[PDB]
Write an enzyme that holds these catalytic residues in place. Structure first.
Site, short mmCIF file in Angstrom:
data_model
loop_
_atom_site.label_atom_id
_atom_site.label_comp_id
_atom_site.label_asym_id
_atom_site.label_seq_id
_atom_site.Cartn_x
_atom_site.Cartn_y
_atom_site.Cartn_z
CB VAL B 100 -0.93 0.01 1.23
CG1 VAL B 100 -1.79 1.27 1.25
CG2 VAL B 100 -1.82 -1.23 1.25
CB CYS B 101 0.93 4.23 0.49
SG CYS B 101 1.32 5.96 0.51
CB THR B 102 5.78 5.06 -0.16
OG1 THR B 102 5.43 5.23 1.22
CG2 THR B 102 5.43 6.32 -0.94
CB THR B 120 3.65 4.13 -5.39
OG1 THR B 120 4.06 4.31 -4.03
CG2 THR B 120 4.17 5.29 -6.23
#
Lengths: 229, 227
Positions: B100-102, B120
Protein backbone atom coordinates in the site's frame (compact mmCIF):
# COMPACT_ATOMS: atom_id res chain seq x y z
CA UNK A 1 3.99 22.97 21.24
CA UNK A 2 2.31 24.24 24.41
CA UNK A 3 -0.40 26.01 22.36
CA UNK A 4 -1.35 22.84 20.49
CA UNK A 5 -4.96 21.83 19.95
CA UNK A 6 -5.65 19.02 22.43
CA UNK A 7 -7.49 16.07 20.86
CA UNK A 8 -8.44 13.07 22.97
CA UNK A 9 -9.75 9.64 21.96
CA UNK A 10 -11.24 7.25 24.49
CA UNK A 11 -9.37 3.94 24.14
CA UNK A 12 -11.16 1.00 25.74
CA UNK A 13 -11.02 -2.81 25.68
CA UNK A 14 -12.67 -4.31 22.59
CA UNK A 15 -12.68 -1.03 20.66
CA UNK A 16 -13.08 -1.24 16.88
CA UNK A 17 -9.61 0.04 16.13
CA UNK A 18 -10.31 1.67 12.73
CA UNK A 19 -12.88 3.95 14.42
CA UNK A 20 -9.89 5.46 16.26
CA UNK A 21 -6.91 4.95 13.95
CA UNK A 22 -8.59 6.40 10.86
CA UNK A 23 -9.40 9.74 12.48
CA UNK A 24 -6.09 9.68 14.36
CA UNK A 25 -3.99 9.67 11.19
CA UNK A 26 -6.17 12.40 9.63
CA UNK A 27 -6.04 14.69 12.65
CA UNK A 28 -2.37 14.06 13.46
CA UNK A 29 -1.63 15.50 9.99
CA UNK A 30 -2.84 18.94 11.11
CA UNK A 31 -0.52 21.72 12.34
CA UNK A 32 0.42 21.69 16.03
CA UNK A 33 -2.04 19.10 17.34
CA UNK A 34 -1.44 16.88 20.36
CA UNK A 35 -3.40 13.62 20.42
CA UNK A 36 -4.11 11.68 23.60
CA UNK A 37 -5.35 8.10 23.94
CA UNK A 38 -7.24 8.00 27.22
CA UNK A 39 -8.17 5.13 29.51
CA UNK A 40 -8.31 4.44 33.24
CA UNK A 41 -4.52 4.05 33.30
CA UNK A 42 -1.80 4.28 30.64
CA UNK A 43 -0.75 1.02 29.05
CA UNK A 44 -1.83 -1.60 26.53
CA UNK A 45 -5.46 -1.93 25.46
CA UNK A 46 -6.48 -4.73 23.09
CA UNK A 47 -8.86 -3.93 20.23
CA UNK A 48 -11.57 -6.33 19.10
CA UNK A 49 -9.36 -7.66 16.29
CA UNK A 50 -6.43 -8.36 18.62
CA UNK A 51 -4.46 -5.28 17.58
CA UNK A 52 -2.75 -3.84 20.68
CA UNK A 53 -2.91 -0.07 21.20
CA UNK A 54 -1.34 2.00 23.99
CA UNK A 55 -3.20 4.51 26.16
CA UNK A 56 -1.02 7.55 26.81
CA UNK A 57 -2.89 9.06 29.77
CA UNK A 58 -5.34 8.30 32.55
CA UNK A 59 -8.66 10.05 33.05
CA UNK A 60 -7.20 11.90 36.03
CA UNK A 61 -4.11 13.24 34.24
CA UNK A 62 -5.76 14.11 30.93
CA UNK A 63 -5.52 17.85 30.19
CA UNK A 64 -8.63 19.82 29.26
CA UNK A 65 -9.48 18.80 25.71
CA UNK A 66 -10.45 20.89 22.72
CA UNK A 67 -11.91 17.80 21.03
CA UNK A 68 -13.12 14.60 22.68
CA UNK A 69 -13.87 11.64 20.40
CA UNK A 70 -15.50 8.35 21.39
CA UNK A 71 -14.94 5.39 19.02
CA UNK A 72 -17.22 2.39 18.89
CA UNK A 73 -16.89 -1.35 19.01
CA UNK A 74 -17.96 -4.42 20.92
CA UNK A 75 -16.74 -2.77 24.12
CA UNK A 76 -19.29 0.07 24.03
CA UNK A 77 -21.86 -1.94 25.99
CA UNK A 78 -19.65 -1.94 29.07
CA UNK A 79 -18.84 1.77 28.67
CA UNK A 80 -22.53 2.72 28.60
CA UNK A 81 -22.77 1.59 32.25
CA UNK A 82 -19.30 2.67 33.45
CA UNK A 83 -19.82 5.65 35.82
CA UNK A 84 -16.14 6.58 35.77
CA UNK A 85 -15.97 6.81 31.97
CA UNK A 86 -19.30 8.63 31.75
CA UNK A 87 -18.22 11.18 34.37
CA UNK A 88 -14.99 11.86 32.47
CA UNK A 89 -16.89 12.36 29.20
CA UNK A 90 -19.38 14.77 30.80
CA UNK A 91 -16.60 16.76 32.47
CA UNK A 92 -14.61 17.16 29.25
CA UNK A 93 -17.74 17.91 27.19
CA UNK A 94 -18.59 20.86 29.46
CA UNK A 95 -15.73 22.88 27.93
CA UNK A 96 -14.68 21.10 24.73
CA UNK A 97 -14.89 23.00 21.48
CA UNK A 98 -16.24 19.82 19.84
CA UNK A 99 -17.82 16.70 21.34
CA UNK A 100 -17.57 13.88 18.84
CA UNK A 101 -17.92 10.18 18.13
CA UNK A 102 -17.68 7.56 15.41
CA UNK A 103 -19.90 4.50 14.91
CA UNK A 104 -21.44 3.15 18.14
CA UNK A 105 -19.41 5.66 20.14
CA UNK A 106 -22.51 7.86 19.88
CA UNK A 107 -24.35 5.38 22.11
CA UNK A 108 -21.81 6.24 24.84
CA UNK A 109 -22.46 9.94 24.31
CA UNK A 110 -26.14 9.04 24.62
CA UNK A 111 -25.62 7.18 27.88
CA UNK A 112 -23.76 10.24 29.19
CA UNK A 113 -26.81 12.41 28.47
CA UNK A 114 -25.20 14.40 25.68
CA UNK A 115 -27.61 13.50 22.84
CA UNK A 116 -30.88 14.67 24.44
CA UNK A 117 -32.70 16.69 21.79
CA UNK A 118 -29.69 16.55 19.44
CA UNK A 119 -29.34 15.21 15.91
CA UNK A 120 -26.99 12.26 15.72
CA UNK A 121 -26.05 9.20 13.70
CA UNK A 122 -24.37 5.85 14.35
CA UNK A 123 -23.69 2.52 12.64
CA UNK A 124 -26.59 1.56 10.39
CA UNK A 125 -27.31 -1.67 12.29
CA UNK A 126 -27.74 0.07 15.68
CA UNK A 127 -29.42 3.29 14.54
CA UNK A 128 -32.71 2.45 16.29
CA UNK A 129 -31.01 2.77 19.70
CA UNK A 130 -30.49 6.53 19.30
CA UNK A 131 -34.08 7.60 19.97
CA UNK A 132 -34.38 6.01 23.46
CA UNK A 133 -31.32 8.07 24.44
CA UNK A 134 -33.16 11.25 23.43
CA UNK A 135 -31.47 11.80 20.08
CA UNK A 136 -33.08 12.83 16.82
CA UNK A 137 -31.85 10.00 14.55
CA UNK A 138 -30.45 11.18 11.20
CA UNK A 139 -29.54 8.78 8.39
CA UNK A 140 -26.48 10.62 7.11
CA UNK A 141 -22.78 9.80 7.20
CA UNK A 142 -21.61 12.78 9.28
CA UNK A 143 -24.14 14.71 11.37
CA UNK A 144 -23.55 18.09 13.00
CA UNK A 145 -25.68 19.72 15.69
CA UNK A 146 -23.93 22.73 17.18
CA UNK A 147 -20.61 21.52 18.57
CA UNK A 148 -21.67 17.84 18.37
CA UNK A 149 -20.34 15.89 15.39
CA UNK A 150 -21.14 12.20 14.99
CA UNK A 151 -20.06 9.79 12.27
CA UNK A 152 -21.82 6.67 11.06
CA UNK A 153 -20.37 3.17 10.96
CA UNK A 154 -16.63 2.36 11.15
CA UNK A 155 -15.11 3.80 7.96
CA UNK A 156 -17.23 6.94 8.31
CA UNK A 157 -14.51 8.05 10.73
CA UNK A 158 -12.42 9.21 7.77
CA UNK A 159 -15.18 11.43 6.36
CA UNK A 160 -15.93 12.64 9.89
CA UNK A 161 -12.32 13.57 10.55
CA UNK A 162 -11.97 15.56 7.33
CA UNK A 163 -15.18 17.43 8.23
CA UNK A 164 -13.78 18.18 11.68
CA UNK A 165 -10.45 19.27 10.18
CA UNK A 166 -12.23 21.97 8.16
CA UNK A 167 -13.96 23.28 11.29
CA UNK A 168 -10.78 23.35 13.39
CA UNK A 169 -8.77 25.01 10.61
CA UNK A 170 -10.30 25.73 7.19
CA UNK A 171 -11.38 24.02 3.98
CA UNK A 172 -8.00 24.54 2.31
CA UNK A 173 -6.22 22.69 5.12
CA UNK A 174 -8.72 19.82 5.08
CA UNK A 175 -8.37 19.54 1.30
CA UNK A 176 -4.57 19.43 1.57
CA UNK A 177 -4.84 16.56 4.04
CA UNK A 178 -7.36 14.78 1.81
CA UNK A 179 -4.88 15.02 -1.09
CA UNK A 180 -1.96 13.82 1.07
CA UNK A 181 -4.12 10.80 2.04
CA UNK A 182 -5.04 10.26 -1.64
CA UNK A 183 -8.62 9.94 -0.39
CA UNK A 184 -10.45 9.49 -3.71
CA UNK A 185 -12.17 6.21 -2.85
CA UNK A 186 -13.08 3.63 -5.49
CA UNK A 187 -14.67 0.69 -3.65
CA UNK A 188 -14.62 -2.57 -5.64
CA UNK A 189 -18.23 -3.32 -4.65
CA UNK A 190 -21.30 -1.22 -3.86
CA UNK A 191 -22.29 -2.95 -0.60
CA UNK A 192 -21.36 -0.27 1.94
CA UNK A 193 -24.94 0.65 2.82
CA UNK A 194 -28.01 -1.50 3.52
CA UNK A 195 -29.76 0.46 0.76
CA UNK A 196 -27.28 -0.62 -1.95
CA UNK A 197 -25.93 -3.99 -0.80
CA UNK A 198 -27.54 -7.16 -2.19
CA UNK A 199 -30.61 -8.06 -0.14
CA UNK A 200 -29.09 -11.42 0.77
CA UNK A 201 -26.08 -9.63 2.29
CA UNK A 202 -28.21 -7.23 4.34
CA UNK A 203 -30.35 -10.06 5.73
CA UNK A 204 -27.26 -11.95 6.92
CA UNK A 205 -25.84 -8.75 8.41
CA UNK A 206 -29.06 -8.15 10.34
CA UNK A 207 -29.28 -11.71 11.68
CA UNK A 208 -25.59 -11.85 12.63
CA UNK A 209 -26.22 -8.71 14.73
CA UNK A 210 -29.58 -9.73 16.23
CA UNK A 211 -28.24 -11.06 19.53
CA UNK A 212 -25.98 -8.04 20.04
CA UNK A 213 -28.88 -5.70 19.24
CA UNK A 214 -31.18 -7.32 21.82
CA UNK A 215 -28.45 -7.14 24.47
CA UNK A 216 -27.61 -3.52 23.64
CA UNK A 217 -31.29 -2.56 23.69
CA UNK A 218 -31.54 -3.69 27.31
CA UNK A 219 -28.36 -1.81 28.22
CA UNK A 220 -29.69 1.24 26.36
CA UNK A 221 -32.97 1.24 28.30
CA UNK A 222 -31.12 0.91 31.61
CA UNK A 223 -28.90 3.86 30.67
CA UNK A 224 -31.97 5.86 29.66
CA UNK A 225 -33.58 5.15 33.04
CA UNK A 226 -30.55 6.60 34.84
CA UNK A 227 -30.89 9.82 32.85
CA UNK A 228 -34.58 9.97 33.80
CA UNK A 229 -33.86 9.73 37.54
CA UNK B 1 -5.14 -24.26 6.92
CA UNK B 2 -5.95 -20.79 8.22
CA UNK B 3 -4.87 -18.05 5.80
CA UNK B 4 -1.71 -16.43 7.18
CA UNK B 5 -1.53 -12.69 6.50
CA UNK B 6 1.53 -10.69 7.46
CA UNK B 7 2.15 -6.95 7.57
CA UNK B 8 5.63 -5.50 7.90
CA UNK B 9 5.56 -3.11 10.86
CA UNK B 10 8.51 -0.73 10.83
CA UNK B 11 9.53 2.48 12.62
CA UNK B 12 7.90 5.58 11.10
CA UNK B 13 5.23 3.60 9.26
CA UNK B 14 2.16 5.54 8.12
CA UNK B 15 -0.15 3.66 10.44
CA UNK B 16 -3.38 3.92 8.41
CA UNK B 17 -1.66 2.08 5.54
CA UNK B 18 -1.58 -0.92 7.92
CA UNK B 19 -4.53 -0.45 10.27
CA UNK B 20 -7.08 0.08 7.49
CA UNK B 21 -6.30 -3.19 5.72
CA UNK B 22 -5.83 -4.93 9.08
CA UNK B 23 -9.39 -4.26 10.26
CA UNK B 24 -10.79 -5.34 6.87
CA UNK B 25 -8.82 -8.58 6.65
CA UNK B 26 -9.04 -9.54 10.34
CA UNK B 27 -12.84 -9.55 9.81
CA UNK B 28 -12.57 -12.63 7.57
CA UNK B 29 -13.03 -16.26 8.63
CA UNK B 30 -10.09 -18.61 9.00
CA UNK B 31 -7.37 -15.96 8.92
CA UNK B 32 -4.49 -15.15 11.23
CA UNK B 33 -2.84 -11.73 11.01
CA UNK B 34 0.76 -11.06 12.03
CA UNK B 35 2.60 -7.77 12.56
CA UNK B 36 6.22 -8.50 11.72
CA UNK B 37 9.41 -6.70 12.70
CA UNK B 38 12.96 -7.67 13.61
CA UNK B 39 11.75 -8.36 17.16
CA UNK B 40 8.32 -8.36 18.81
CA UNK B 41 7.42 -5.31 20.83
CA UNK B 42 6.57 -1.65 20.39
CA UNK B 43 7.06 0.10 17.05
CA UNK B 44 6.21 3.80 16.82
CA UNK B 45 4.38 5.12 13.76
CA UNK B 46 5.16 8.46 12.12
CA UNK B 47 2.31 10.13 14.04
CA UNK B 48 3.53 8.91 17.43
CA UNK B 49 0.92 6.15 17.65
CA UNK B 50 2.49 3.08 19.27
CA UNK B 51 1.82 -0.31 17.63
CA UNK B 52 3.04 -3.74 18.72
CA UNK B 53 4.83 -6.24 16.50
CA UNK B 54 3.64 -9.76 17.28
CA UNK B 55 6.51 -11.74 15.75
CA UNK B 56 10.13 -11.54 14.70
CA UNK B 57 11.27 -12.41 11.19
CA UNK B 58 12.38 -15.85 12.43
CA UNK B 59 9.12 -16.81 14.15
CA UNK B 60 6.89 -15.61 11.32
CA UNK B 61 5.03 -18.57 9.78
CA UNK B 62 5.05 -19.07 6.02
CA UNK B 63 2.72 -16.39 4.72
CA UNK B 64 -0.14 -16.66 2.28
CA UNK B 65 -0.14 -12.86 1.95
CA UNK B 66 2.68 -10.43 2.69
CA UNK B 67 1.78 -6.73 2.79
CA UNK B 68 4.22 -3.81 2.96
CA UNK B 69 2.75 -0.49 4.15
CA UNK B 70 4.33 2.87 3.41
CA UNK B 71 5.43 5.91 5.34
CA UNK B 72 8.42 8.05 6.22
CA UNK B 73 10.24 4.89 7.31
CA UNK B 74 10.39 3.31 3.85
CA UNK B 75 13.59 5.15 2.94
CA UNK B 76 15.54 3.23 5.56
CA UNK B 77 13.97 -0.08 4.51
CA UNK B 78 14.96 0.44 0.88
CA UNK B 79 18.62 0.08 1.96
CA UNK B 80 18.16 -2.48 4.76
CA UNK B 81 19.53 -5.82 3.49
CA UNK B 82 17.89 -7.82 6.29
CA UNK B 83 14.42 -6.44 5.60
CA UNK B 84 14.82 -6.85 1.84
CA UNK B 85 16.06 -10.44 2.22
CA UNK B 86 13.15 -11.28 4.54
CA UNK B 87 10.68 -9.85 2.02
CA UNK B 88 12.23 -11.90 -0.79
CA UNK B 89 12.16 -15.04 1.41
CA UNK B 90 8.42 -14.67 2.03
CA UNK B 91 7.57 -13.54 -1.51
CA UNK B 92 9.12 -16.74 -2.90
CA UNK B 93 6.11 -18.86 -1.88
CA UNK B 94 3.45 -16.35 -0.78
CA UNK B 95 0.22 -16.65 -2.71
CA UNK B 96 0.12 -12.84 -2.88
CA UNK B 97 2.86 -10.22 -2.58
CA UNK B 98 1.29 -6.87 -1.80
CA UNK B 99 1.79 -3.29 -0.67
CA UNK B 100 0.00 0.00 0.00
CA UNK B 101 1.21 3.53 -0.82
CA UNK B 102 5.01 3.87 -0.74
CA UNK B 103 5.33 0.27 0.41
CA UNK B 104 5.66 -0.55 -3.29
CA UNK B 105 9.00 1.31 -3.26
CA UNK B 106 10.25 -1.30 -0.78
CA UNK B 107 9.04 -4.10 -3.08
CA UNK B 108 10.91 -2.28 -5.83
CA UNK B 109 14.14 -2.08 -3.84
CA UNK B 110 13.84 -5.83 -3.21
CA UNK B 111 13.68 -6.46 -6.97
CA UNK B 112 10.06 -7.60 -6.98
CA UNK B 113 8.62 -5.00 -9.39
CA UNK B 114 10.90 -5.77 -12.36
CA UNK B 115 8.72 -5.82 -15.44
CA UNK B 116 5.47 -5.62 -13.45
CA UNK B 117 2.57 -3.17 -13.54
CA UNK B 118 2.41 -1.28 -10.23
CA UNK B 119 1.24 1.91 -8.55
CA UNK B 120 2.12 4.01 -5.48
CA UNK B 121 1.25 7.33 -3.84
CA UNK B 122 0.63 10.01 -6.48
CA UNK B 123 3.45 12.26 -5.23
CA UNK B 124 6.11 9.52 -5.53
CA UNK B 125 4.86 7.77 -8.67
CA UNK B 126 7.92 8.83 -10.70
CA UNK B 127 10.09 6.52 -8.57
CA UNK B 128 8.49 3.30 -9.85
CA UNK B 129 10.15 3.31 -13.27
CA UNK B 130 13.78 3.35 -12.00
CA UNK B 131 12.90 0.30 -9.87
CA UNK B 132 11.82 -1.57 -13.01
CA UNK B 133 8.03 -1.26 -12.77
CA UNK B 134 5.61 -0.38 -15.53
CA UNK B 135 3.90 2.57 -13.78
CA UNK B 136 0.09 2.49 -13.89
CA UNK B 137 -2.08 5.37 -12.64
CA UNK B 138 -4.81 3.28 -11.06
CA UNK B 139 -5.79 2.96 -7.43
CA UNK B 140 -5.36 -0.83 -7.14
CA UNK B 141 -3.16 -2.61 -9.69
CA UNK B 142 -2.90 -6.37 -10.10
CA UNK B 143 -0.16 -8.13 -12.06
CA UNK B 144 -0.28 -11.87 -11.49
CA UNK B 145 0.03 -12.40 -7.75
CA UNK B 146 1.26 -8.83 -7.13
CA UNK B 147 -1.30 -6.32 -5.87
CA UNK B 148 -0.31 -2.73 -5.17
CA UNK B 149 -2.48 0.07 -3.82
CA UNK B 150 -2.03 3.79 -4.29
CA UNK B 151 -1.65 6.39 -1.55
CA UNK B 152 -2.66 5.87 2.11
CA UNK B 153 -6.44 5.45 2.10
CA UNK B 154 -6.26 3.25 -1.00
CA UNK B 155 -5.43 0.49 1.48
CA UNK B 156 -9.14 0.06 2.19
CA UNK B 157 -10.00 -0.44 -1.49
CA UNK B 158 -6.96 -2.70 -1.86
CA UNK B 159 -7.99 -4.84 1.10
CA UNK B 160 -11.54 -5.35 -0.15
CA UNK B 161 -10.13 -6.36 -3.55
CA UNK B 162 -7.83 -8.86 -1.86
CA UNK B 163 -10.65 -10.21 0.33
CA UNK B 164 -12.64 -11.14 -2.77
CA UNK B 165 -9.62 -12.93 -4.27
CA UNK B 166 -8.91 -14.92 -1.10
CA UNK B 167 -12.60 -15.79 -0.62
CA UNK B 168 -15.33 -14.48 -2.95
CA UNK B 169 -17.41 -11.42 -3.77
CA UNK B 170 -20.15 -12.17 -1.24
CA UNK B 171 -17.61 -12.38 1.58
CA UNK B 172 -16.08 -9.05 0.56
CA UNK B 173 -19.54 -7.46 0.35
CA UNK B 174 -20.42 -8.65 3.86
CA UNK B 175 -17.29 -7.02 5.24
CA UNK B 176 -17.92 -3.84 3.26
CA UNK B 177 -21.41 -3.58 4.79
CA UNK B 178 -20.15 -4.24 8.34
CA UNK B 179 -17.59 -1.44 7.84
CA UNK B 180 -20.33 0.80 6.37
CA UNK B 181 -17.83 1.59 3.60
CA UNK B 182 -20.00 3.87 1.47
CA UNK B 183 -17.68 6.88 1.43
CA UNK B 184 -18.98 10.45 1.13
CA UNK B 185 -15.90 12.69 1.30
CA UNK B 186 -16.70 16.30 2.27
CA UNK B 187 -14.41 17.62 -0.51
CA UNK B 188 -13.25 16.46 -3.94
CA UNK B 189 -9.51 16.93 -3.36
CA UNK B 190 -8.33 13.33 -3.09
CA UNK B 191 -6.49 13.28 -6.43
CA UNK B 192 -4.21 15.80 -8.16
CA UNK B 193 -6.62 15.65 -11.11
CA UNK B 194 -9.58 16.98 -9.08
CA UNK B 195 -8.09 19.06 -6.26
CA UNK B 196 -7.84 22.84 -6.62
CA UNK B 197 -4.57 23.98 -8.17
CA UNK B 198 -3.63 25.85 -4.97
CA UNK B 199 -4.04 22.66 -2.92
CA UNK B 200 -1.93 20.62 -5.33
CA UNK B 201 0.83 23.24 -5.20
CA UNK B 202 0.89 23.15 -1.40
CA UNK B 203 0.89 19.34 -1.23
CA UNK B 204 3.73 19.14 -3.76
CA UNK B 205 5.67 21.84 -1.90
CA UNK B 206 5.42 19.88 1.36
CA UNK B 207 6.51 16.58 -0.23
CA UNK B 208 9.47 18.09 -2.11
CA UNK B 209 12.22 17.40 0.43
CA UNK B 210 11.06 13.81 0.98
CA UNK B 211 10.85 13.24 -2.78
CA UNK B 212 14.39 14.53 -3.34
CA UNK B 213 15.81 12.30 -0.60
CA UNK B 214 13.87 9.35 -2.03
CA UNK B 215 15.08 10.07 -5.57
CA UNK B 216 18.62 9.53 -4.25
CA UNK B 217 17.82 6.36 -2.28
CA UNK B 218 15.93 4.93 -5.26
CA UNK B 219 18.86 5.37 -7.62
CA UNK B 220 21.24 3.63 -5.20
CA UNK B 221 18.75 0.78 -4.74
CA UNK B 222 18.37 0.43 -8.50
CA UNK B 223 22.14 0.41 -9.02
CA UNK B 224 22.43 -2.48 -6.56
CA UNK B 225 19.87 -4.52 -8.49
CA UNK B 226 21.80 -3.87 -11.70
CA UNK B 227 25.24 -4.80 -10.33
Amino acid sequence: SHMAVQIGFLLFPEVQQLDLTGPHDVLASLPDVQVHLIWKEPGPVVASSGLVLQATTSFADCPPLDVICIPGGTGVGALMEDPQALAFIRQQAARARYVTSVCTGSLVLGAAGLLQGKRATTHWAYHELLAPLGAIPVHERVVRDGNLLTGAGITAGIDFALTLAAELFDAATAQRVQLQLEYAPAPPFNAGSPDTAPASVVQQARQRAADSLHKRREITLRAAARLAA
